[PDB]
């Protein structure tokens, strides 16, 4: 599973910079080692800050404050493809920020045949207003009357004696 | 001498030979109580719950 | 050896508690704690001789 880490890093102090600036990003990685590497790669290509001259000052995994409340998350991502420059925004309805990011990775890796390294997340926000929801699918999920039958039921001991009911 | 190698993590007699301290070890000591001072300031919480 | 082994174990526990307490006070007060970089590393060879 994925874990959301907040990573704060800064360059090593020198005579030119007694005290450096602190740079913090909230990024998703299965383990802390991946998060630290991704943070340095983001800093290298955004601030041109080298890992050799920089150090990680803090790192903390963040749990979802309300994992029992359904929420709608809008994710702004950057796609690196054969062209190598795409900006996309998707909306996922789930209970935790981790699940939405995992759903996004599964969706893009399936539809667009992408990879973890290519995909970079600019921002993840929680859509707290129904009017702010843009996708029609999510708007349906927020309708007052969710009403649908059980989908994809499909339900060793081979050679069953009777035909399956596979219904109500 | 040493026809067979015996694991100190399994053979307790070999462990007492190599480590003359495992007799008095007391691994699980209790240092906490019902007065744990949760230490997380509002400044750190605001930074953590930011963006 | 018994006294030396007891001293070593108490040193490990004191050092481990020291890191926990120092990080707790840095987290609570507001600054950040940077623990010492590792000095001992364990290397395992995962590729063959071909």
């Amino acid at each position: 599973a994925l874990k959301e880490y907040q990573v704060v890093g800064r360059k090593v102090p020198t005579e030119h910079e007694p005290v450096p600036k602190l740079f913090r990003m909230r990024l998703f990685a299965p383990n802390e080692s991946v998060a630290k590497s991704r943070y340095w790669y983001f800093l290298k290509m955004i601030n041109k800050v080298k890992k050799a001259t920089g150090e990680i000052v803090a790192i903390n995994e963040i749990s979802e404050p309300k994992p029992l409340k359904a929420k709608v998350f809008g994710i702004w991502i950057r796609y690196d493809s054969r062209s190598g420059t795409h900006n996309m925004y998707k909306e996922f309805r789930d209970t935790t920020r981790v699940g939405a990011v995992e759903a996004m990775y599964a969706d893009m890796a399936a539809r667009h045949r992408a990879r973890f390294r290519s995909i970079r997340i600019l921002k993840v926000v929680e859509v707290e207003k129904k009017e702010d929801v843009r996708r029609n699918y999510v708007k349906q999920l927020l309708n007052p009357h969710l009403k649908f039958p059980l989908p994809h039921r499909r339900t060793k001991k081979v050679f069953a004696p009777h035909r399956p009911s596979t219904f109500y | 001498a040493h026809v067979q190698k015996k694991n100190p993590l399994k053979n307790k007699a070999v462990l007492s030979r190599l480590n003359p301290y495992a007799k008095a070890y007391k691994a699980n000591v209790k240092i906490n109580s019902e007065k744990t001072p949760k230490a997380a300031g509002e400044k750190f919480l605001s930074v953590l719950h930011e963006n | 050896i018994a006294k030396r082994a007891e001293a070593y174990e108490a040193e490990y526990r004191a050092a481990e508690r020291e890191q926990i307490e120092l990080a707790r006070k840095a987290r609570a007060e507001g600054n950040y704690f940077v623990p010492h970089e590792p000095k001992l590393i364990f290397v395992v060879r995962i590729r063959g001789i071909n």
Binding site: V19, K21, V57, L122 | - | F33
Partner: peptide, 19 residues
């Protein structure tokens, strides 16, 4: 060695990758 980094006047700034 272990050291502290004061956050006074050096508050961390959240970063986002360039679109």
């Amino acid at each position: 060695k272990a050291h502290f980094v004061s956050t006074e006047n050096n508050e961390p700034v959240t970063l986002h990758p360039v679109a």
